[PDB]
Design a protein around this ligand. Sequence first.
Ligand code: NA
Length: 129
Amino acid sequence: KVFGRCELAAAMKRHGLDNYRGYSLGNWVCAAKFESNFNTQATNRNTDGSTDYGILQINSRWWCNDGRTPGSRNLCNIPCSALLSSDITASVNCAKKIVSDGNGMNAWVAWRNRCKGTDVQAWIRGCRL
Ligand code: NA
């Protein structure tokens, strides 16, 4: 599923991401935009053999099991395919665990490089929230 900007903002808010660990809603919408272009089916392979999955491009090395990343942890206790679902619950629930680990939203490369220090409120402007 390819979300609309405001439709994603409302689902993230419903799941409790607005101000989760001090990160306003605009940060999560910005990160989803640059990580997956709002597509729940997005996958990208890395050089180390790991794979990033879903709307928030959650990596198979630490967070999920895809059965092909040797010596990898499954810290969110889920199959990576659960992160490609049109329902974002698993992606949101796993993202809350990642953002809590100590590095905050810096775990998402595209957030650090394209959202961090910008006007992230613009990503929710015009939405009925
Ligand atoms: Na894994």
